[PDB]
Amino acid sequence: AYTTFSQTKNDQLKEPMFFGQPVNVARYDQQKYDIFEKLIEKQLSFFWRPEEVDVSRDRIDYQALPEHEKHIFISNLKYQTLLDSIQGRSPNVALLPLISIPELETWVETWAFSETIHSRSFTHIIRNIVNDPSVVFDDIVTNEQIQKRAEGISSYYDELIEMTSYWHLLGEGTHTVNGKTVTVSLRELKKKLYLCLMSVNALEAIRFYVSFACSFAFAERELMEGNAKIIRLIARDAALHLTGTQHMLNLLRSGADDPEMAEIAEECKQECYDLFVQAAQQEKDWADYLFRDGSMIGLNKDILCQYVEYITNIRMQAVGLDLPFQTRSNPIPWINTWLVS
Template identity: 75%
Template sequence: MQEPMFFGQTVNVSRYDQQKYPIFEKLIEKQLSFFWRPEEVDVSKDRLDFQALPDHEKHIFLSNLKYQTLLDSVQGRSPNVALLPIVSIPELETWIETWAFSETIHSRSYTHIIRNVTQAPELIFDDIVSNDKISERADAVTTYYDDLINSVSLYNLYGEGKHDINGETVVVNLFELKKKLYLAMMSVNILEAIRFYVSFACSFAFAERELMEGNAKIIKLKSRQSCTHNSKILKTNQAKSNTNNVINLCGTTHKITKNATQLKIAA
């Protein structure tokens, strides 16, 4: 009960009879109640709809799916890789694992959709990592994850202080690590609350024309889960943070928010 959310002692026994932050237990229960499988949604009509779309609309539909697939691939693993090594309380540890698991369902749902509309799904998936436009949009999120993951690795290996690593002097500072955590969580919040909804708008626009409605039903299920991911971690962390430290980060977080908002306006 004395440990902070992050950067305290590592979690030992996963016990839930005593919880420092009961909000995470509520989030876990809510997330589990939203469980669904992509195969539950009938997308058979979508195949006929897709075949009748003009080429430019096929391009829009598939490009949107590629973007969603890449970002949910990131979200399916990055919370675990970035946050579990530094988490210090069991209820938060379980929430992170539950959150990441739900993201893997989202990734599977895109495979379900793409297999249905094309006979060569491998061509769609192979293009994702080689498409510069999609990678560029994803970089806005992965940059902060990568920065946190690399810094935490150094912290766990060497501890705080100055270290000579591969001929370079590297400074490991706990306050700087907390800043990187804050910025990573801010970028995730913006991903879940703005960036994903830009792509959802595209999916729902087709459904408004009574096209690709199976896809829209899947996105609706995904959207419901994304609401729980608009991170209570960040909100709780802000409440526990030193005000001056948060103010010092406002310039960077404003830039992240502005960039994501521009994407929404452009959509």
């Protein structure tokens, strides 16, 4: 029931963001929600090339760091690398099959494309600071701490993908497969979509932002500056991605786009809240590990933890969730010099 070109003539301005008729014609002269076209344009105006950034002095900087500083750095790098591996493919594989408006379709492909460039930038850094990048790359997959910090990201995507396949193959219903009853419900699939979006919004809004705080800590010190320039270009793209997820979520709950989606959202608020908090907690628990055999100079477990709280509150308010934490002003205003967005 999924089609690469639906032959029905339809008003693309009247479809919902998700679950309506798959997009046929790709046109950009008009949009239901212009935010998406605006986001495609800015992201294209931001196009950059990693290799164009000189990281030649980062190797010695890294060599000269203290062992626990190498640890904090490399470790944070491995996490950023993991998130972008996932983000390079997921939005395409997970969302494309469910989008019903063209501007949203292309924004998703552009967004995913910008993420592959981030991944290439990490190969650029890694290749220039270590002797055998393979060590770093292998560690990303099995590293217990990161599977830990990043736990449940791949799973929200995976289940949504699975459910979408059943929905496209069998459609709404109670069916049977190899002696098992399999129930397919649109509403539960819309809930799966909603929660997956929420989780990608936290990935973009928080998980990535926390990593920036670590990278920029080195930059503040004039250390690993090739990495810093690259991370600055990345945070600028991240700002657009988060705008995109905020808008999709806000349009969904507001009921304007899909009445049923607004109901689903509302009824799942506490579920939504807990994930957000759960996510903040993961980032804190990791700030823990990273700082235990030693603590960086200008950042530490407590400062990072305060930062996790501060941004989390900002992000949750943005999509109408309650503030889980104590209100406080930014603990590391020096970060602003690097977050040009």
